[PDB]
Amino acid sequence: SKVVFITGATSGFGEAAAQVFADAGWSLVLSGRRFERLKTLQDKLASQVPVHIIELDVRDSDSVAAAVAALPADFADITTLINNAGLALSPQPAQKVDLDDWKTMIDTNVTGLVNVTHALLPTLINHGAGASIINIGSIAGQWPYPGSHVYGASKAFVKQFSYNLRCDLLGTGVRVTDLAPGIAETEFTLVRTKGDQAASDNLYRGTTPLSARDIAEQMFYIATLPDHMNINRVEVMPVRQAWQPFAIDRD
Amino acid sequence: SKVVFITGATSGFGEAAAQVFADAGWSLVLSGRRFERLKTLQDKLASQVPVHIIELDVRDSDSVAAAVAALPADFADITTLINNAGLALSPQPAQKVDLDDWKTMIDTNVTGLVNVTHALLPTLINHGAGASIINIGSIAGQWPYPGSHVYGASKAFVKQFSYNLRCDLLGTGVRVTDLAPGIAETEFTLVRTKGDQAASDNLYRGTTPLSARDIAEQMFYIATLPDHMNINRVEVMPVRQAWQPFAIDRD
Amino acid sequence: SKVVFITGATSGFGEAAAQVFADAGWSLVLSGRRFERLKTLQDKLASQVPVHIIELDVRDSDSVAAAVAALPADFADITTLINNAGLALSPQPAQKVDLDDWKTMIDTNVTGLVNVTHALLPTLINHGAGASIINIGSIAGQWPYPGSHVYGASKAFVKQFSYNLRCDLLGTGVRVTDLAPGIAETEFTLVRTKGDQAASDNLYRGTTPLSARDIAEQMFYIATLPDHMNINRVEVMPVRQAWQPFAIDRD
Amino acid sequence: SKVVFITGATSGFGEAAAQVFADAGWSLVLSGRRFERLKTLQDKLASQVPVHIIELDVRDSDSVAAAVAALPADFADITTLINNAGLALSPQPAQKVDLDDWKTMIDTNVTGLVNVTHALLPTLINHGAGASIINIGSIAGQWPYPGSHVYGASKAFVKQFSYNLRCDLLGTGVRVTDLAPGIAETEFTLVRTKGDQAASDNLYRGTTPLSARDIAEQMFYIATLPDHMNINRVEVMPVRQAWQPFAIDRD
């Protein structure tokens, strides 16, 4: 009778997390916008565990509020909320980015994460011991780099929102954790280049990035943590990723 | 000449910054939503320096773009942009905040700050050498505390967005700085308590907070920095403000 | 075979980690200054797994270099180095601290930590895939608080020292992790009060702090991580610990 | 009068800071190990302001204590303490650095800085309003990069040690500030490369780094700050210096 609420379960980390929690007997609540991928994932996982799918755009707060209020009884009691739904766009410098791409990232990684958190806060508090809010931040939320502009800032929002939630949830038993992954081969770079599969292959070629299951098993590790423990933040990078020297402009 | 673009100049830091730059001969272009106090500030400063006022709400991207397009010739060439427009709401714990208060802060401190930057990015690059983007962050953008929930997260967005802007504007000479002040006695706390001056008066009592003009003299220092220097972030607190021990839940 | 090098294994995290790694078949190399506790620990764990004890003061670099050079063949191949040996002193304000207490923390938490890394760096690089350097930092290495002065600064050193090591160890496969725990009931506060067990009971009374086995299981989780992954930093606090409001000096 | 205690005044920031403080009538106390540079600065500056020189190695606490106790009456009342004495060594990767170079960095930037503060803390507290402890950090104290190993970690120590000092000195009016500069042509790389002038010219070539007087003029700005304000940290970079993308090991 353990239920996990996974946003953005149609691909990447969310899709892998649905399978990792299913192998552990957890009931699943999978959301996203590609409904025909949720139906495909439901039919593959309804055998193992009970599955509840939702066609949900996290940028619409009224839809998320309705989706949480309309949860059936076999799902309403959420133990773990995984705020995974997110995206990056326009990897070019900030002076060459369209403002609608900046708005799409803010609406999903900031407002979308705050929309889902607000809707599930009473549910997670009414659970209590063992409850976890797993916010998926990024290494970009701490380390600046060219082409990150609003994506990294949105993930720094996610980091501080996680710490601030802990200050206000003291005594409720609810845990808030920022899982901040490094470079990982999912649909992330494909969405970030608006469909340039060659770019998403030249980036990961010749290196060992994180797999989608690497982050999913980290989500499960955080969710099954003992009730008295709380991870403030985990920054997970592939060991083949680090930091370069400072950029110095030269004549 | 030298022109400053000040958002949210109707009160607090913004109105005090208008007087600090006027005393140095800088031309002013001040924005905000309460036009009737902007007109009062214009007539007080039109003697010292030429002033152009704009009724602008930073949450409207189309209005911000039009406001920049309608800039007079003696004003369009902005040297320093001060992204001062911001607000906090609901000092209660996060589990007791209405979602409209969270949306208002994201729409103003996050979306509003990127709206002004996007519209003026071509303008600031065509200036160069001495151009500066002064983003008004906060200690809340780095340090968590109870009741900050989305405010601190929004100011952490501003911190990382400033660093990321520096990565993309390398070689243009344009400077980006996060001015992160501590507690200061302005109209700020009145907005955060929805009009309770008594709550805004129990604060600042018996202590020496920062003044509104004090941050202005610090904003002017950043704008007048030599062209080859760039301050990534300066966190200025009143010397009577610091950090408490960790919160420990007991029985 | 897999061998772990644990500094400060006589109590707390190191002693608990020795039992957790013994339960997984890992060969142990336990160091410390209390030799009569290392001898008792060898008999408790030599049954399950081969154990090698070393009387070592990490502040003596020549003693550390000789101790690693004198490793037997069934131990020389170190997979995981856990730099756990550390201590805090003088919880009073900095202006009332004796400098020898400041020096002991620097000699142990800073110099002692780089001494062990310097002595074992060639061994870990000659290991390669799966090797880990687990530096035991603290929440004090990121968040300032009263009574933390050189202790928190020493743990901020280890945080950045871990990040900097990763930049230089790219391509060697060895992983560096800052495990930064929160408040935990060990001999830690006993050493910080120079033996006041009453003070170490008034601190932990009425709350649920971290156990030594909680952090010990975190070391094992990090050490057994898949070879391609690397945890930059994990800050684990007891869920009953968070951040207080800002300190404001008042009349 | 007003007296400044400057460590590491034989070159770079310390030597340049001596002239800027002399231009304001402040009495000077300059330390360092190269006496023939201290005597030359005294003969050049004894005209403007009274100067007291000390051949002091900050690594010997007893000498630091003796130098502070033996201050003449026209010097003992120090207003601003600038912990500037510091150094980096071995720019090669950490696995190819001799431990004696690591100890020199820890002894000077960590142990040496706490030695000077411990000896001068009672005097600065007995000064009261306007006293400042200006710790010279670095961008290396926050941002990791290859070749920084112990230098960046030591500057992370000073960053957190600055924050922690404010928690213990709350209400005394004495200010603690982390001045974290970027790349600067300050004879730093010459000492840092063990005398390689060719390497110290290719680093600053074709770019505009910070000057010793640029940072010196920043030290004076912090020292002349109003007594009620405190700069927690100011990170000053050349606008032609920023952050590069993440390092990815390939092939």
Ligand SMILES: NC(=O)C1=CN([C@@H]2O[C@H](COP(=O)(O)OP(=O)(O)OC[C@H]3O[C@@H](n4cnc5c(N)ncnc54)[C@H](OP(=O)(O)O)[C@@H]3O)[C@@H](O)[C@H]2O)C=CC1
């Ligand atoms: N991959 C990486 O390198 C890193 C990724 N991350 C974070 O990991 C998380 C997962 O991204 P990843 O899985 O890697 O990339 P994917 O594109 O593979 O996953 C994207 C997920 O986000 C969902 N999503 C996007 N926008 C919305 C929306 N408005 N409403 C609902 N669901 C939405 C998608 O579902 P649909 O499109 O069907 O709505 C999809 O399930 C993201 O938050 C990303 O920032 C963090 C660090 C590094």
Ligand SMILES: NC(=O)C1=CN([C@@H]2O[C@H](COP(=O)(O)OP(=O)(O)OC[C@H]3O[C@@H](n4cnc5c(N)ncnc54)[C@H](OP(=O)(O)O)[C@@H]3O)[C@@H](O)[C@H]2O)C=CC1
């Ligand atoms: N007060 C403090 O102690 C601290 C303040 N700050 C920052 O200082 C900045 C200024 O606030 P402060 O100076 O404190 O005093 P105020 O909070 O009184 O200034 C608030 C400003 O926000 C402007 N504003 C709000 N919504 C909009 C909008 N949609 N479009 C344009 N302007 C808008 C207001 O202009 P109008 O109301 O006329 O629209 C007003 O001038 C804020 O960003 C705050 O985060 C940072 C750290 C600490």
Ligand SMILES: NC(=O)C1=CN([C@@H]2O[C@H](COP(=O)(O)OP(=O)(O)OC[C@H]3O[C@@H](n4cnc5c(N)ncnc54)[C@H](OP(=O)(O)O)[C@@H]3O)[C@@H](O)[C@H]2O)C=CC1
């Ligand atoms: N416990 C807590 O609340 C927290 C602890 N930490 C870190 O945990 C680590 C220690 O675990 P702790 O919890 O302190 O458990 P203890 O302090 O009870 O055990 C600490 C160990 O450090 C060893 N040690 C200390 N100084 C030296 C030295 N100079 N040379 C060799 N060995 C030494 C001791 O062995 P001997 O005495 O036999 O030499 C002892 O076994 C420290 O690094 C501490 O900073 C981090 C965050 C919170």
Ligand SMILES: NC(=O)C1=CN([C@@H]2O[C@H](COP(=O)(O)OP(=O)(O)OC[C@H]3O[C@@H](n4cnc5c(N)ncnc54)[C@H](OP(=O)(O)O)[C@@H]3O)[C@@H](O)[C@H]2O)C=CC1
């Ligand atoms: N240069 C840069 O680009 C950056 C510098 N910094 C910091 O700023 C400070 C100045 O660097 P820089 O401007 O290069 O000046 P230098 O590094 O050229 O020399 C600085 C001073 O350190 C003193 N010093 C070194 N070791 C000791 C010691 N053991 N005891 C006493 N004094 C000592 C030297 O005097 P002696 O002749 O007695 O050795 C010298 O006067 C340093 O602390 C450095 O860490 C920070 C960021 C970047």
